[PDB]
Amino acid sequence: MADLIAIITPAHDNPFFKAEAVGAEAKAKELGYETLVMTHDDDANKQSEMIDTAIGRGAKAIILDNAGADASVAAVKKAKDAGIPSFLIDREINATGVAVAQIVSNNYQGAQLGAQEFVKLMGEKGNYVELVGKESDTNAGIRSQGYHDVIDDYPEMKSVAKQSANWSQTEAYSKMETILQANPDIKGVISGNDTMAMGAIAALQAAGRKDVIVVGFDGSNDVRDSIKSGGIKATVLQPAYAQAQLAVEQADAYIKNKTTPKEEKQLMDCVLINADNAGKLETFALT
Ligand SMILES: OC[C@@]1(O)CO[C@H](O)[C@@H]1O
Numbered sequence: 001m002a003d004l005i006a007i008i009t010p011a012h013d014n015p016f017f018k019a020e021a022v023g024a025e026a027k028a029k030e031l032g033y034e035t036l037v038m039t040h041d042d043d044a045n046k047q048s049e050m051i052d053t054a055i056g057r058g059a060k061a062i063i064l065d066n067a068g069a070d071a072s073v074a075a076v077k078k079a080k081d082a083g084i085p086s087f088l089i090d091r092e093i094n095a096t097g098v099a100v101a102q103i104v105s106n107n108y109q110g111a112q113l114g115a116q117e118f119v120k121l122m123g124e125k126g127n128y129v130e131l132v133g134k135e136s137d138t139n140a141g142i143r144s145q146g147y148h149d150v151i152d153d154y155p156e157m158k159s160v161a162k163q164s165a166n167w168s169q170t171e172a173y174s175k176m177e178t179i180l181q182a183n184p185d186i187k188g189v190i191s192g193n194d195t196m197a198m199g200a201i202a203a204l205q206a207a208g209r210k211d212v213i214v215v216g217f218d219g220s221n222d223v224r225d226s227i228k229s230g231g232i233k234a235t236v237l238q239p240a241y242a243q244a245q246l247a248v249e250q251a252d253a254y255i256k257n258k259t260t261p262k263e264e265k266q267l268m269d270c271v272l273i274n275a276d277n278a279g280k281l282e283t284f285a286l287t
């Protein structure tokens with residue numbers, strides 16, 4: 001009898017997406033909804049299958065962390081034309097007026113915070129590597145732009161490789177091994193996300209290069225723990241749990257009386273995480 005909210009994210013092997021799913025589920029149930037939690041594994045066909053499932057089950061709203069900024073438009077529009085609104089988190093789509101909300105972190109602002117800390121830790125000089133995210137996710141390019149708009153003020157810092165590891169810890173490990181072999185004279189690595197930072201720090205440790213400075217982005221417990229143990233030096237918190245809950249709150253308001261947010265596209269502030277506040281961070285929230 002209870003209304004159903006469908007929650008669709010990428011795979012839960014990245015703790016960011018698991019945390020979004022659990023935060024969205026918690027808020028939905030707190031507000032009296034049943035939930036259907038599905039993963040699309042960054043596969044647009046799987047995402048389309050899951051949206052079909054939400055439609056067939058009669059979901060009253062979809063919470064979506066999407067499988068590609070371009071590829072996801074049609075599936076969101078399919079749900080819309082079936083009378084089911086979507087509230088997107090984390091990742092934008094390249095279309096307005098289709099989703100009811102797109103609630104994302106302020107990726108450019110956050111990336112600048114991380115790069116400013118990276119520059120400081122690097123002493124404004126030295127060779128570095130950059131790991132970038134998936135081309136299909138606009139966050140990858142926004143963060144890389146924020147990083148370079150900071151780092152291009154420091155002429156003694158030089159990028160000696162810039163490679164995508166597709167938001168994957170395992171790809172980042174393998175990539176980092178290759179990059180390090182070709183560029184032993186590196187002083188730091190700046191990563192577009194935390195799973196790639198985890199892969200990079202592990203590859204560097206296996207190579208006996210604990211001297212290399214690594215900065216990530218997301219604020220996961222895994223990277224927090226690395227910061228606490230003297231591994232990775234900093235990251236940038238995206239408020240994943242609160243963002244997922246806010247999407248459900250807006251979904252509920254829309255279901256109840258068609259309240260819509262004044263602006264579809266919404267930003268949430270990021271915060272730098274380093275050794276001084278890592279001990280206040282838990283499951284993508286500071287206390
Ligand atoms: O690790 C989570 C992400 O940083 C990677 O994919 C999306 O952009 C997230 O924000």
Ligand SMILES: [Ca+2]
Nearest residue numbers: 149150152153
């Ligand atoms: Ca600049």
